[PDB]
Curated annotation (Swiss-Prot), chain A:
The lineage of its organism: Bacteria, Thermotogati, Deinococcota, Deinococci, Thermales. The keyword Ribosomal protein applies. SUPFAM superfamilies: Ribosomal protein L13 (SSF52161). GO terms for molecular function: mRNA binding; structural constituent of ribosome. Coiled coil: none annotated. Disulfide bonds: none annotated. The keyword Cell wall biogenesis/degradation does not apply. This is Large ribosomal subunit protein uL13. InterPro entries: Ribosomal_uL13, Ribosomal_uL13_bac-type, Ribosomal_uL13_CS, Ribosomal_uL13_sf. Part of the 50S ribosomal subunit. Keywords: Ribonucleoprotein, Ribosomal protein. It holds the Pfam family Ribosomal_L13. PROSITE patterns: RIBOSOMAL_L13. This protein is one of the early assembly proteins of the 50S ribosomal subunit, although it is not seen to bind rRNA by itself. It is important during the early stages of 50S assembly.
From Swiss-Prot, chain C:
Part of the 50S ribosomal subunit. Forms a cluster with proteins L14 and L19. The lineage of its organism: Bacteria, Thermotogati, Deinococcota, Deinococci, Thermales. It comes from Thermus thermophilus (strain ATCC 27634 / DSM 579 / HB8). The mass differences between the observed and calculated masses are suggested to be due to methylation, which is known to occur in the E.coli and R.palustris orthologs. One of its GO terms (biological process) is translation. Keywords: Methylation, Ribonucleoprotein, Ribosomal protein, RNA-binding, rRNA-binding. One of its GO terms (molecular function) is structural constituent of ribosome. Gene3D superfamilies: 3.30.160.810, Translation factors. This is Large ribosomal subunit protein uL3. Belongs to the universal ribosomal protein uL3 family. One of its GO terms (cellular component) is cytosolic large ribosomal subunit. Transmembrane segments: none annotated.
From Swiss-Prot, chain D:
The keyword rRNA-binding applies. InterPro entries: Ribosomal_uL6-like (IPR000702), Ribosomal_uL6-like_a/b-dom_sf (IPR036789), Ribosomal_uL6_a/b-dom (IPR020040), Ribosomal_uL6_bac-type (IPR019906). It comes from the Bacteria. This is Large ribosomal subunit protein uL6. Belongs to the universal ribosomal protein uL6 family. It comes from Thermus thermophilus (strain ATCC 27634 / DSM 579 / HB8). HAMAP family: Ribosomal_uL6_B (MF_01365_B). Keywords: Ribonucleoprotein, Ribosomal protein, RNA-binding, rRNA-binding. Coiled coil: none annotated.
Swiss-Prot record, chain E:
GO terms for cellular component: cytoplasm; ribonucleoprotein complex; ribosome. This is Large ribosomal subunit protein bL36. Zn(2+) binds at residues 11, 14, 27, 32. It comes from the Bacteria.
Length: 140, 22, 204, 174, 37
RNA sequence: UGGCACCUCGAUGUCGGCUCGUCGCAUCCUGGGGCUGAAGAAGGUCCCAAGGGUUGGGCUGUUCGCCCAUUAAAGCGGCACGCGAGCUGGGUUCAGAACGUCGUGAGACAGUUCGGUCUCUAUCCGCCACGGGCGCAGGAGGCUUGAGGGGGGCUCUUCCU
RNA sequence: AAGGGAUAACCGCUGAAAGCAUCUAAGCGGGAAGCCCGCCCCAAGAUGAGGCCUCCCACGGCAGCCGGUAAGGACCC
């Protein structure tokens, strides 16, 4: 008897209020939703997980002195091209990047991991455009 | 900046070509 | 934050208070407004200006239509000035007054595939004392095994010129509205005949 | 030994209503909101406000006293009012009032004009005495500090902006 | 300000303060003002 | 400066210069400070700071150093003591010659001296430029937002006060 | 450059634990040629491939192919 593999499945759209949630710990959950690993029919080689919409990212939360000390870093390829941008500033300029960059790092590398990232739709502020998909609210 | 004078290990090229072989 | 399209015509100098004033002359007006950009509609604010008249026999239908909608006869060139909303539906050189100071963009003269010396004022080689065929060569480009590679942006021979250059804080010396002439003091990118943009200056 | 435990006398008639995270103190000189730890309990008894720490843990003992004084101060401020006086010593140096604002003359190639912030009143009795008057203790000592900084007291000469009751301590010059 | 890996009192009036995760020593005599480093 | 002898002796070209730089900061200058046996001006010493700057000439292969004239300053170091498929080739490895010295001798020297062959063609990565292709769910002609990058970042003299 | 903003060392306001004192534990100021922005240039292969304006349009036979067009485009000069 050979292991079960799903035929193509229509993916569930789930929605999550990020407000006040502990950044990183929200982040791990979103990944599992993303990979599909909450589903009993999980298959490692195909995009069979959820689409996660997060809202109120600006209002992510964080322990210790990370606001002032956690530094996101970008390398340009040029001499002297390391950019160090601290979490405070990041939220202050592209708040949605904070959760995004957290989640990214906790998905697999590779083509599929990259596709899974594309299924994460993160927003600043209460509202999001995917009314069409009628996303199911999750409390995590 | 090294003081102990650094002798070359190699001879400055070069002498002669093994021309031809045929 | 006004601005205007125009073509560069040339240089002379004038005399003002017993001084020679090198000037470039620019034919600026008249530039009809042909689209406005609005924050509601566009996300920001600027005028699309037209400039120089065009033979409607050469104006393809998608373009003819854009002009049409803006109730404006065909123009050779369309360029936006950013964050500028003129009251009128036509911008002319009148918006500059002698003594104002402005910035001018234009496209620099192409120099084609330029060596390291013309491009980057490298020092080239000796021309004697033993120099072997390296008299305009760039020299070393690297280190050794560390880092074993070349920097991005290492200055090198390549194309040079025929680029956007904006030259800043030039003095308007005179404006001649009877002829659409702008006399800016000093020198502006591009060949006589080039197209230029004249904006109110940012340096204060 | 204890500041948080001492109670705060509230003269007639200043109001002291309490909300979580702040206490609001109104009086004859106006009002002042006092931001206060959620951890402390501010207690309103008859013509007395009292403050209570949840434990004898270090953080709390510290939060305790600070809290009292802040409310205590707010009280005194909206009633009596708060002030600091600045003396100006040095020969050519003198200050006069320009409209609402303070103009200082202190040896520079120019006067220094100083704006009253919201809630501050400058008063120049003599020309070598300036008074920073306000309802906010903290704000007053601030503006005071600022003005003083415009020309600190010299280390060699009795000269520059002084605090009333500031010791002239100088040192030798040769 | 003296800067050292041994900051201590110098006179009876000296006072060790710990300020923003550093150990200073403030005092009425300016010569005695120290930071640790 | 050494110790060790681990890749490399079916080759990792080595001093110095030139050219091009890039980085560290234990900062020479310029910005900002504390203390001063800081009156002033000037200066000592320490802290913060690597953005930019950091001259021309005599000697010598020299690096280094000394010196002349300046200067805000004339910083120190890393990059195979950066850079010979980039140049040089003055120096230090060959063959010639000589001096001093040593050896009976042939010869020798971490001595001196004059002379002495430095290799048109870039596969790949990297770099500077420029296109071709496809894509950006209809095809088109214009005009643009700027995510993200890169460039730039020096300083003096005088006068007023 | 100006200018805005956040900082370094440093200086502070208010202030307990510690009845005094304390720039700090709560909070708030001031503060560098440096940092962010601002200036100039590149830039939607930004495959996260954005936006605005205008043009063409439902063409024949069996998310496919073929043929003639549309707006346009290329070729050639
Ligand atoms: Mg779950
Ligand atoms: Mg499997
Ligand atoms: Mg945003
Ligand atoms: Mg793996
Ligand atoms: Mg142009
Ligand atoms: Mg040409
Ligand atoms: Mg060249
Ligand atoms: Mg040039
Ligand atoms: Mg030249
Ligand atoms: Mg030269
Ligand atoms: Mg030359
Ligand atoms: Mg020569
Ligand atoms: Mg040669
Ligand atoms: Mg030649
Ligand atoms: Mg490498
Ligand atoms: Mg070109
Ligand atoms: Mg005239
Ligand atoms: Mg010309
Ligand atoms: Mg009462
Ligand atoms: Mg009780
Ligand atoms: Mg000692
Ligand atoms: Mg003692
Ligand atoms: Mg003290
Ligand atoms: Mg050894
Ligand atoms: Mg070995
Ligand atoms: Mg060995
Ligand atoms: Mg070895
Ligand atoms: Mg070997
Ligand atoms: Mg071999
Ligand atoms: Mg080999
Ligand atoms: Mg070999
Ligand atoms: Mg090699
Ligand atoms: Mg080699
Ligand atoms: Mg170097
Ligand atoms: Mg450096
Ligand atoms: Mg340092
Ligand atoms: Mg200095
Ligand atoms: Mg000093
Ligand atoms: Mg002095
Ligand atoms: Mg003295
Ligand atoms: Mg003196
Ligand atoms: Mg010090
Ligand atoms: Mg110090
Ligand atoms: Mg520097
Ligand atoms: Mg440097
Ligand atoms: Mg010389
Ligand atoms: Mg001579
Ligand atoms: Mg020399
Ligand atoms: Mg010579
Ligand atoms: Mg010699
Ligand atoms: Mg020497
Ligand atoms: Mg000096
Ligand atoms: Mg020199
Ligand atoms: Mg080498
Ligand atoms: Mg070196
Ligand atoms: Mg070398
Ligand atoms: Mg070399
Ligand atoms: Mg060579
Ligand atoms: Mg060499
Ligand atoms: Mg090489
Ligand atoms: Mg090589
Ligand atoms: Mg070369
Ligand atoms: Mg010789
Ligand atoms: Mg030789
Ligand atoms: Mg020989
Ligand atoms: Mg001889
Ligand atoms: Mg002899
Ligand atoms: Mg001998
Ligand atoms: Mg003998
Ligand atoms: Mg003999
Ligand atoms: Mg031998
Ligand atoms: Mg000869
Ligand atoms: Mg020789
Ligand atoms: Mg060679
Ligand atoms: Mg040769
Ligand atoms: Mg070839
Ligand atoms: Mg090739
Ligand atoms: Mg390769
Ligand atoms: Mg292309
Ligand atoms: Mg193409
Ligand atoms: Mg065109
Ligand atoms: Mg937009
Ligand atoms: Mg940008
Ligand atoms: Mg990219
Ligand atoms: Mg600034
Ligand atoms: Mg500020
Ligand atoms: Mg105090
Ligand atoms: Mg005590
Ligand atoms: Mg604090
Ligand atoms: Mg502040
Ligand atoms: Mg502060
Ligand atoms: Mg202050
Ligand atoms: Mg500057
Ligand atoms: Mg573009
Ligand atoms: Mg552009
Ligand atoms: Mg595009
Ligand atoms: Mg990307
Ligand atoms: Mg597009
Ligand atoms: Zn002391």
């Amino acid at each position: 008897m050979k292991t079960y593999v799903p035929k193509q499945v229509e993916p569930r759209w789930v929605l999550i209020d990020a407000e006040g949630k502990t950044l990183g710990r929200l982040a791990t959950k979103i990944a599992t939703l993303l990979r599909g690993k909450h589903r009993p029919d999980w298959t490692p080689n195909v995009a069979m997980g959820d689409f996660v919409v997060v809202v109120n990212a600006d209002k992510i939360r964080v322990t210790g002195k990370k606001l002032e000390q956690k530094i996101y870093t970008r390398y340009s390829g040029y001499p002297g091209g390391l950019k160090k941008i601290p979490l405070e500033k990041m939220l202050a300029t592209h708040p949605e990047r904070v959760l995004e960059h957290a989640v990214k790092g906790m998905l697999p590398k590779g083509p599929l991991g990259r596709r899974l990232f594309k299924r994460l739709k993160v927003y600043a502020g209460p509202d999001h455009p995917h009314q069409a998909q009628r996303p199911e609210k999750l409390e995590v | 900046r090294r003081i102990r004078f650094r002798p070359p290990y190699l001879p400055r090229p070069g002498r002669r070509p093994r021309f031809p072989p045929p | 934050m006004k601005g205007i399209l125009g073509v560069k015509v040339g240089m002379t100098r004038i005399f003002r208070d017993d001084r020679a004033v090198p000037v470039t002359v620019i034919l600026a007006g008249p530039c009809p407004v042909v689209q406005r950009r609005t924050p509601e509609k566009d996300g920001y604010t600027a005028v699309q200006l037209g400039f120089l008249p065009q033979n409607p026999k050469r104006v393809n239908r998608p373009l003819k239509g854009h002009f049409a909608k803006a109730g404006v006869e065909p123009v050779r060139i369309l360029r936006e000035i950013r964050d500028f909303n003129p009251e009128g539906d036509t911008v002319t050189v009148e918006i500059f007054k002698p003594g104002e100071r402005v910035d001018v963009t234009g496209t620099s003269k192409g120099r084609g595939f330029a060596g390291v010396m013309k491009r980057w004022n490298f020092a080239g080689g000796p021309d004697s004392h033993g120099a072997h065929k390296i008299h305009r060569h760039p020299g070393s480009i690297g280190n050794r095994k560390t880092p074993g590679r070349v920097y991005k942006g290492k200055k090198m021979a390549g194309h040079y010129g025929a680029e956007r250059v904006t030259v800043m804080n030039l003095e308007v010396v005179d404006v001649i509205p009877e002829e659409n002439l702008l006399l800016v003091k000093g020198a502006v990118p591009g060949p006589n005949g080039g197209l230029v943009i004249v904006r109110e200056t940012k340096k204060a | 030994s204890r500041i948080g435990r001492l109670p705060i006398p509230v003269p007639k008639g200043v109001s002291v209503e309490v909300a979580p995270g702040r206490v609001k103190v109104k009086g004859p000189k106006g009002e002042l909101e006092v931001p206060v730890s959620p951890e402390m309990r501010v207690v309103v008894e008859e013509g007395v406000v009292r403050v209570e720490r949840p434990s004898d843990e270090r953080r709390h003992k510290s939060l305790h006293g600070l809290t009292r004084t802040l409310i205590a101060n707010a009280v005194k401020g909206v009633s009596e009012g708060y002030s600091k006086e600045l003396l100006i010593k040095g020969i050519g140096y003198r200050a006069r009032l320009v409209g609402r604002a303070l103009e200082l003359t202190v040896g520079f190639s120019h006067p220094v004009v100083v704006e009253p912030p919201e809630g501050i009143t400058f008063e120049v009795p003599e020309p070598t005495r300036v008074r920073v008057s306000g309802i906010d203790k903290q704000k007053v000592g601030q503006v005071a500090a600022n003005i003083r900084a415009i020309r600190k007291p010299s280390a060699y000469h009795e000269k520059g902006i002084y605090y009333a009751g500031e010791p002239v301590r100088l040192k030798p010059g040769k | 300000m003296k800067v050292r890996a041994s900051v201590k009192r110098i006179c009876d009036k000296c006072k060790v303060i710990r300020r923003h995760g550093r150990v200073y020593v403030i005092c009425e005599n300016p010569k005695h003002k120290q930071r640790q480093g």
